[model samples]
Target: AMKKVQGIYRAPRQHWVGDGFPVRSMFSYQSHGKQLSPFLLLDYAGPMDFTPTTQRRGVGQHPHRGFETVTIVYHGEVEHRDSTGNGGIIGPGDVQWMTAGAGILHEEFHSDAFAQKGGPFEMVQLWVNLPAKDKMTAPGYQAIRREAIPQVNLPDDAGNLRVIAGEYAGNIGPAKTFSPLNVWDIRLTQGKSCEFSLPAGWNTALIVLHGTLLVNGDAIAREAEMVLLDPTGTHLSIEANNDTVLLLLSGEPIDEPIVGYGPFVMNTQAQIAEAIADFNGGRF
Candidate 1:
């Protein structure tokens, strides 16, 4: 019995990606690895708002090969208030930049909190695959803002769907990718339900952002929940027992070998050795 819900691993303690981003690492190659297929990694940034003034936050220098990194900003916000009684709320932004094909070096950081009301920079960055044939191509980057993305409303106000990339009901997103995939950001209303179909045999996952969701039509997936589905089915439905935001994902498996080392992902161990050697030799 392949657990339709797969493994519902709750969120672990947060970790820093670049020296800048303190992220909630939901998934990585070390965990589910290629069981997630085309998807390699995902990190959820803050709902935590920086008050008045602060130094800054962000990632430092890094290198990546054979994949793309996608950034999605929603409501430009964060903070899960505790006993301190502090809280914040904001709406959203969108951008997908940096596809490190072949190989490339770069850095990212949020500018200093300049506003009188310094806000939390909330976003999600995902590492996606570019297929074996396309691995050693050229690097690329772009920024797709909110208005440019597709914000489609579900029927009868059941919910809303933001197509960050890929297709949903003939509506496509502004972020271009190397493969057919769905990086749909969905927000469902309380006590409502919706149904849809995805290609059979593709790896599909539902990241429960902030809300309760019913899986196997049973378990309650609250915040920091990620659901990986059985690749055999073609249809999926969601019953939002309560208002919730879900990062719905599905992609056709890359169907290739993954020999990944730190910062680089190639098809064989020797390829990784090659990258590591380049990082050291007369390459600079």
Candidate 2:
């Protein structure tokens, strides 16, 4: 069976964490039911131009618990520092994977050069949910450089696929996950077509960052729209009507109850309270 589009939504307008920079949200904790399992949120930060700034502009330090943040840079640059003693500069095609297992604090901003020179800034931050067994494992970080990401060629030279996480054909991404998940970046030329198969029962969705795509003959024309796929099908066929880019996310569903509040996601109310207390007491 083919995985068909279940629902489609355009990204909503939202303010970035602390800096209030505008973002287009493809999906969030509030958007769906179990269809988006093992995934919590996604925010696309701008293809917008930034003027030179005397002061750096971006989100300030913040605490997170019980989840992971995967920041993928498409253009420009960003500097990141965290409580775990991890820090780095992410440029185009770089990915910062931070696992806030128990708790951790981090901050992100445009690089001084980028901020001072001013240019286009674009990125996507995705929040992936941890299973109950691994939520409190340990905080960790990885900077998957652009050169480190693995890619696979689609049939007919239609497009290229970047396996950021999970496996595609015989290649696997560099990012480590607590559970099984697949994250891919697909770039297609206009009039090209491609097909891929996903495991049955895995929750899947496609976020159209730019251009238009026809999924299994169903047209999805809007840019920044997310298409949720039915879990029962194992295959998906896509055709690009224009030069397009898309993020494909799929993972096994975490069946346990998900109790989330603000930046914390846990299994129970008490866990949520503990996260709050940890943040208040400076435990993160």
Candidate 3:
């Protein structure tokens, strides 16, 4: 049995996120029916050009609870600072794993040099839902630099795999996780193909970031489009028609109540109220 393409979804119109940076919102908590448990939201930020601005560009401090965010930078640079005194710059092939376990305040913006120079920017952010047991743990962060990410070279020079989380064959990622999950960044040359096996119990999906990818023979032709994979299969194949980059996210469902309000995700409405009160009182 093989993983099947469940559905194809094109990314929606560009929308401004926290401050004013344009982003493509793929999926969120409010999406109707067939919720992809353990995975909450996805935001694709620019493959667009940014002109030099006198002022720095980015989102102001924001609070989050009950989830984690994995940010992958494919082009340009991003600088992040959090209330935990963690700050850093991540460029091409770098990833930041932020766990807003209990609660935390953080901000993101273009790196000072990048903002001054101005160039292309492209990135992807995925929100990973925390299980009830770990939802209130202290906030933590992991800055997985490009050099630390483990890569698996595909046979025949077909492509390369960046294992940021979870495992592929014997290779594993560097990012720590509260739950079992697999996040892979695959770069394939045109006309190249590869096969991968995943656990049948894991919910799987692929988001195309560059060029077109043929998944199990079905063509995922558009950039920024997401394709859901069947949950009953353990095997799949991908073929690139052009130089392509894709992100694969797969994880076991938490199967718990997901109560969410703006910037807060909990298991009940009462928790949301507490979160709101805490934030309003500057408790973050």
Candidate 4:
């Protein structure tokens, strides 16, 4: 069975996320709500340039609860520090997986050195919502480096695939997700093709990070676009229209109530109110 194409969405436009990032709100809770489920929102920041600077250039002091933030750094660098005293630097190929279970305060900034000698910067910050039962399990973090992620080479010099937060061809990504999900970073050489299968019934979608992709050899997907699919397929397919890069996302939909507000996600309005009170009281 092959998954059916549901829709193809182009990132609306670029906007600043605070003064730190110039981003394309790829998709969000407000747009798709729980259609993507377990996954809440995605912000793709820069494949742009930054001039050298001394000041910390990033989002500062924000509170989060009820979800996890997964930051995948493609270029330049990012330094993150949280109220829990967990912090680190993520450079190209590194991922910052921070769980805001219960609650936590944090700031994200350009690494001091990178700020001093900036060049290009690119990263994707994805939000995966917590299940009702695990909403307040605990606050945690995983600093996954580029090298720490395993790379799988396709046969006959097709391209490379990096397992970021799930499994692929027997390779498992390092992130310990509370839910079952798959996050794969893939690149294919021009004129080449590849094939793979995700679990039947998982929410299946892919982001065209760069270049053009010919899906199922019929439909085409371009950069900054997300392609949604009906999750009944036994296999998914792709061909590189040009040298291409893509981020593959697949997860079992968390079929539950999704009630949320700015920075906090919950199953009810009452829980959201409680979260606000806790943050304001500096309990996180």
Candidate 5:
């Protein structure tokens, strides 16, 4: 039974990363949890031409606990190094998933090419909450190549869809997750449309990146606005004007009280203190 799940949202573009030669940040802390619970922050960086000047501002060593950082590289290259000695160069079309459990310190810097040859560097860093049960686990990372992501070419009437992490229109994403979550990177050709069936209880929303979408039946003509859908077992139909790219994500209700402060997220301030102490104590 499909029903129209109208969307809602707060703000999108908020800067977090410091200024200088290495500036990164689309939205500092997109607390989607206000409307879409469980998800902490979503930061979209790049898609902007950048060149390394004498002053480069890379995010210094920071501490994180009780959450996961998912980095999706769309263009350019970045060298990632962590205290765990688990680092790699995540270039174009690669997905880097890192879980900072107990605690970890790491930093990511754009490649010299990005610093010299000015080009578009696009990517998104998302913060997902971990249930109390798994909050204190050890840190980990996963590098997913672009080819590994499941994608389907839409037939004449159906629009093209790229399954990034969730299920949509008979297709499902390949990325494995700890929670019940669905995420996708979809694009629709001009006048093309597709439906997304969402579970009844999960919190869902649609974000327009490149084009527009006709949610339910009304035309939403804006890229800066994110439609936070109301919980409904409705099939969301999107129509692309010229060519549209958007991200659809949803997850079962976390309902748990979330305590997020800076880079640390937990159920209590005590745990937040512990995380800070661990990072300062050299528990990378």
Candidate 6:
């Protein structure tokens, strides 16, 4: 079942209304017919210009249930604090994973170094949902430093691989999951390429954050698009035209119903209702 399919399907990202300023987010492969598993959403918040010594951008306390949130810093620093009594600042290559199983309230902000004149700020926040059984489990957080994540060099030096989660590239990420999944942060030098195999029937996508990529012979150049691959493709190849950084992600399909209401993602409407009530009651 090794196949290749590529094309752009326009899906608009609706603006999120919050107590504060709304940040920019890109929604890809979220169509009614293609909500992949393990990976629920991907958001890229950017390289915005701001002055040093002053705070630039950040979101207020929010609630997430039945899932995990992984925050990775590409530039600048982000200050993280959660109701779990944990707080810290993350910089380039640093990652923070928070599991809001039954519930959790969290707030993240930018530090003075990144908010003020230090330059532009950039990072990606990924929402990974848990299986139906893990939804009501106790909540927790794991802060993994950049030096802690394993990096698997591509054979032939075609690229450098960082396994943030899952398996396959001969290296596994430090984070464990309730479901089967694999997440790889790939860096490809110009003219170099890599081919990797995925499960034959798994739901998967290739999300390019920057630079150019060739998906099944056709060139895809959008920095904010996620290409949902055909389930028939057991193996995929990504060749770089210029220096590129991309996420090679795959997972076991979740066929259970997805109930999404505001910041909560669950399997049933009843669950969504419970989530809203919890957030409103300060139980998160």
Select the stronger candidate by lDDT from 2 and 5.
2
TM-score order of candidates, best first?
4, 2, 3, 6, 1, 5
Off by over 4 Å in 5: 1-16, 19-31, 52-57, 168-172, 219-221
Which candidate number would show the highest lDDT if scored against the true structure? 4
Q: What is the C-alpha RMSD, rounded to one decimal, of candidate 6?
A: 2.7
* Collision count for each candidate, in order: 9, 0, 0, 0, 11, 5
lDDT of 6 by residue, 1-284 (tens): 55456445433353433312223454422442254676777776655545565444567888878888888777778888888888898888888888988888888877756665566667778788787888887889888789988887787778788888887545778877787888778888778877788887777777777777777666465566667777757888788887788877788876676787767888889988888887888777
The lDDT of each candidate is 0.75, 0.87, 0.86, 0.88, 0.69, 0.73
Among the numbered candidates, top TM-score falls to 4
Superposed by TM-score, candidate 6 places the C-alpha of residue 211 at a distance from the truth, in angstroms, of 1.1
Per-residue lDDT over 10-112 for candidate 3, one digit per residue giving the tens place of the 0 to 100 score: 7689988754257898778667213577789889998888888767688998899999998899888889999988899989989999999899999999898
Model 3 TM-score, 2 decimals: 0.95
Off by over 4 Å in 2: 14-16
4 or 5, which is superior by TM-score? Answer: 4
Query: RMSD for each model, in Å, please?
Result: 6.9, 1.3, 1.5, 1.0, 2.9, 2.7
Task: Kindly indicate the candidate among 1 and 6 with the higher lDDT.
Answer: 1
Which digits, one per residue and each the tens of the lDDT, describe model 1 over residues 71-161? 7776343221111122122136656556788877665555433234666657788889889999987887765667887889998799999
Q: Put the candidates in lDDT order, highest first.
A: 4, 2, 3, 1, 6, 5
- Report residue 67 deviation for candidate 2 (angstroms): 0.6
- Model 2: how large is the Cα RMSD against the reference? 1.3
lDDT of 5 by residue, 1-284 (tens): 54454544433554547541222332333344555655666666655776655433456667778888887777877767776779887778788878887777888777656666657777777777787888887888888888888778766755666776767566667666668887777777778777667788777767666666676667474454466677656566677765777777678767777777888888888877777777677765
The digit string of per-residue lDDT tens for model 2 on 1-284 reads 99988888866776665562458877776656366988898888888888888887888888888899999999889999999888989999999999998988988889988988888888999999898988897999999999999978888889899999999999989999889999999998889998889999999998888989988888574588889999989999888998899999999888977888988988889999999998898778
- Between prediction 2 and prediction 6, the one with superior lDDT is 2
Model 1: lDDT of residue 252: 86
User: How does each model score on TM-score?
Assistant: 0.88, 0.97, 0.95, 0.97, 0.87, 0.89
